[PDB]
């Protein structure tokens, strides 16, 4: 998967889209605009290099390259930004609806062939490489051309051509007074007609709920940290790729702005001798260290040469039972090792054999790891990792090796000696009851970073000029009230059974 995702938002501007069936409900136009804004914000946070565009059809004005009638291209394909969201924000209500009607117009005829032609033309203009091409059609008219059969055939031909070119078409049908029947016309236009998506729908599509679900986490495409050589011997070498399935998420780095016009300023660091005042190149300086009441001077090149031990790669050392590995010897986040046939042919077979036999024999491959040049070696254990899939056949545990860093003698620390006081069985049983009361199922994706979420909320509020920032719910905070309710009198009994009457833990 290489390229950028391109998305075009087609929104109908017919009269039927501007009527509210119930007093307390959203018109189709308002729902469409809300969805567009939500997708824009999600894209800004997640993938900022993707291309989005917004088009309207059924209007009185026209703005397009082909000079077609009744098609207004509001925003051509470009990366998302705050200005575009603000531009869309002036159609978000009833006054916004009046503003939209005044600016463009509504209630005019149209041809779907021309609309799809304009969308394809927009796709053609893009000069980058697009991995996906998608159009979403927001409408509530199941039979756009019931009077004219020729227009329907033209639309079918254009949809077929677009599908051939590699453009996905999706229908996001909104609520209709009489109900939406995809069976009438939109079966041929739609890219994929699901078996369940054939009955008449009396409510908006289930895709709107997913669109309105804001995603506020960066999505990074697959990428290999390094391509290394695993050396079983001086002659047997295979090529492997190293990946990181867990990486800490950090706030985007701040940029320095000039206050009077908000234009970026570039910074530069230079070193100049106190006496002469002139600049000193890096070649006109040395390095020093004090030890034993003396000064030891070394050049920079030697300072870097001190770190050179062996060439980049993994060197096999032997095989170790998995029992000898320890869970409390964690040192650094683990990595993933997978085969790579691009550099050496036949690596996949040997890697598969090693994985299978390591799983059968319950062993881990001990190795010496040197990621880059001028990096002292570390010791790693490659633990086999079988393939595990969930119910829906979506792979959840990939096959390969897990690279775990092992500590050196210097990385451990000495603990103060503490006398052991064991607990009588009754205390252990009471605490077992307490533990059992508060049992729950844990998943790796059950928590969110409060700091990053608040940062993104604040940034969005500042950018879009909202009244107040949205406040994120912190799921890491304990639920004290629920725990107190569940435990009941267990806490009091345990405290009576384990703490003297006059202890005062707080003091």
């Amino acid at each position: 998967y290489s390229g950028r995702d391109s998305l075009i938002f087609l929104v109908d501007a017919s009269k039927a889209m501007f009527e509210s069936q119930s007093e307390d409900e959203l018109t189709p136009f308002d729902m469409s605009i809300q969805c567009i804004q939500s997708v824009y914000i999600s894209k800004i946070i997640s993938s900022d290099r993707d291309l989005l565009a917004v088009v309207f059809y059924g209007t009185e004005k026209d703005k397009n390259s082909v000079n077609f009638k009744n098609i207004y291209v509001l925003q051509e394909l470009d990366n998302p930004g705050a200005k575009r969201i603000l531009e869309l924000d002036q159609f978000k209500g009833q006054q916004g609806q009046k503003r939209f009607q005044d600016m463009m117009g509504h209630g005019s005829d149209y041809s779907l062939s021309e609309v799809l032609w304009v969308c394809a033309n927009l796709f053609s203009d893009v000069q980058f490489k697009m991995s996906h091409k998608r159009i979403m059609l927001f409408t509530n008219e199941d039979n756009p051309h019931g009077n004219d059969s020729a227009k329907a055939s033209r639309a079918r031909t254009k949809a077929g051509d677009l599908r051939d070119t590699g453009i996905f078409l999706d229908l996001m049908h909104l609520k209709k007074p009489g109900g939406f029947d995809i069976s009438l016309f939109y079966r041929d236009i739609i890219s994929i007609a699901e078996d369940e998506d054939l009955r008449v729908h009396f409510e908006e599509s289930s895709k709107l709920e997913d669109l309105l679900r804001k995603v506020r986490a960066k999505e990074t495409r697959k990428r290999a940290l390094s391509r290394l050589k695993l050396k079983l011997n001086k002659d047997i070498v295979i090529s492997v790729g190293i990946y990181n399935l867990v990486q800490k998420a950090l706030k985007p780095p701040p940029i320095k702005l000039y206050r009077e016009t908000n234009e970026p300023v570039k910074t530069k660091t230079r070193t100049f001798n106190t006496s002469t005042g002139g600049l000193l190149l890096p070649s006109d300086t040395k390095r020093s260290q004090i030890y034993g009441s003396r000064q030891i001077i070394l050049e920079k090149e030697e300072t870097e040469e001190l770190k050179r031990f062996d060439d980049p790669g993994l060197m096999l050392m032997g095989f170790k039972p998995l029992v000898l590995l320890k869970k409390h010897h964690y040192l650094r986040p683990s990595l993933f090792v997978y085969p790579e046939e691009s550099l050496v042919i036949g690596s996949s077979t040997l890697f598969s054999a090693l994985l299978i036999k390591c799983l059968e024999k319950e062993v881990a491959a001990l190795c010496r790891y040197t990621p880059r040049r001028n990096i002292p070696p570390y010791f790693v254990a490659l633990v086999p990792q079988e393939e595990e899939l969930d119910d829906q056949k979506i792979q959840v545990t990939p096959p390969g090796f897990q690279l775990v860093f092992l500590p050196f003698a210097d990385d451990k620390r000495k603990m103060p000696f503490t006398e052991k006081i064991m607990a009588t069985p009754e205390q252990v049983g009471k605490m077992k009851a307490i533990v059992e009361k508060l049992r729950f199922t844990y998943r790796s994706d059950s928590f969110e970073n409060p700091v990053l979420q608040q940062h993104f909320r604040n940034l969005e509020a500042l950018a879009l000029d909202l009244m107040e920032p949205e406040q994120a719910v912190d799921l890491t905070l304990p639920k004290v009230e629920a725990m107190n309710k569940r435990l009941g009198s267990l806490v009091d009994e345990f405290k009576e059974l384990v703490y003297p009457p006059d202890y005062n833990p707080e003091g």
Binding site: S46, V215, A217, R221, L438, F440, S446, R486
Partner: peptide, 23 residues
């Protein structure tokens, strides 16, 4: 294919964070 993201193609739609849900 099933359970794919409608915003970022090629990625699976992550389930919303649920915190602690006691049994």
């Amino acid at each position: 294919c099933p359970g794919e993201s409608l915003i970022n193609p090629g990625f699976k739609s992550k389930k919303p964070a649920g915190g602690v849900d006691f049994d």
